[model samples]
Target chain A: VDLQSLPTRAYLDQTVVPILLQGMAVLAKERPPNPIEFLASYLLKNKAQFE
Target chain B: VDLQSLPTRAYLDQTVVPILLQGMAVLAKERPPNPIEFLASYLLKNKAQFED
Candidate 1:
């Protein structure tokens, strides 16, 4: 799926996953860890990953 | 986050997931399924449903 994020699994490995993991590190600090917010913020910063 | 699609978990189950499953039903008819097209088509078809 050429989604708004992560075009290839290789990109997933090189770019998306790392950026996502970094954001997830931030999200885990939240009281209730919001996946939507996590995904949004992560993607917003790394929108190139999506393209 | 108010995504282009499915913003909440409840919305995920009631709205996004069901629409996804229904689309999956359509794709499963194919010899091989296409996740990109499935997701794209499903969200496009069900865009209004997302608000509800």
Candidate 2:
């Protein structure tokens, strides 16, 4: 997963941010102990965002 | 002046996110023609965060 491979910031905002927002929404629900871990899992399908 | 030098994702979450949120606040007000440009300019002072 090459993050640099992301074509542009717009791609990131349009594609990645929504998923991140969803993960945030889930975390905000119950206040997960490790939100990053939760997000890591939530974003597992899109590993390129962080990797 | 290296994005890689960012100590951790936590640093980005704690430090950068607030600044980004502020940029979003400004951009959301009127919907700038080039929001990224607005953000990039707003983030100029923190150039080190992006440069290498």
Candidate 3:
């Protein structure tokens, strides 16, 4: 949808679902020291490769 | 788009590009004490509502 009117979780699914699965998977693989920070860094670090 | 061979950021777009905009926006609106942490927590809490 119309992303504007959505709730948080509903908002989460507006298409990140696929890549997020990958995030979850990669997050698992890396064994991040701090999962959140690591994943955040991962996304930022790699945005150049795919974006 | 074989996720297996792709690099990290290329992976980010496999693709999280759109919803990420929402996350970035909500993040800005909330003005988190610690943005990285806050956004992380936000995702965790909401995972329940979305994931089966």
Candidate 4:
């Protein structure tokens, strides 16, 4: 893992990415618009969910 | 930049990150739900826009 990536990558991979993943999952299921912003805020709104 | 990060970071920063950024931008503007999956696919759809 060290050679393949780093601590920051791992942190994001395990933590932030999960939140990011949800935003897309929700967006795809909803099929709404403003698509980028919606997902951005989605994470922002739920930033503390997994913490 | 080289010392701070690497080629892959730069590649994603310049290329994929923009696509990712816009997805969030659009999402916030639209204000909808099911959220995560939506943003993931948003980039996937726009992946071709900015090529590496």
Candidate 4 per-residue lDDT over residues B1-52, each given as its tens digit: 2322444345335434677767656655554444455555665567557441
lDDT of 2 at A14: 53
In candidate 3, what fraction of native interface contacts survive?
Answer: 0.03
| Candidate number of the best TM-score | 4
- Ranking of candidates on lDDT, top first: 4, 3, 2, 1
Ranked by DockQ, the better of candidates 2 and 3 is 3
Per-residue CA lDDT of candidate 2, range B1-52, in tens?
Answer: 2433445554346434565565555655545444444444554444345321
For residues A1-51, could you state the per-residue lDDT of candidate 1 as single tens digits?
A: 433343344433443345445544554444233334333444465544544
Candidate 2 local lDDT, residue A30: 39
Root-mean-square deviation of each candidate, in angstroms?
10.0, 13.0, 10.2, 13.6
lDDT, each prediction:
0.43, 0.48, 0.51, 0.54
Candidates in order, TM-scores: namely 0.33, 0.37, 0.39, 0.44
In Å, residue A6's CA in model 2 sits off its true spot by: 24
lDDT of model number 1: 0.43
What does candidate 3's lDDT look like per residue over B1-30, in tens digits? 455466765644443434355565677566
State candidate 3's DockQ: 0.07
Question: By lDDT, who's the top model here?
Answer: 4
lDDT of 4: 0.54
Alpha-carbon runs more than 4 Å astray in model 3: A1-51, B15-19, B47-52
Binned by DockQ into CAPRI classes (incorrect, acceptable, medium, high), candidate 4 is incorrect
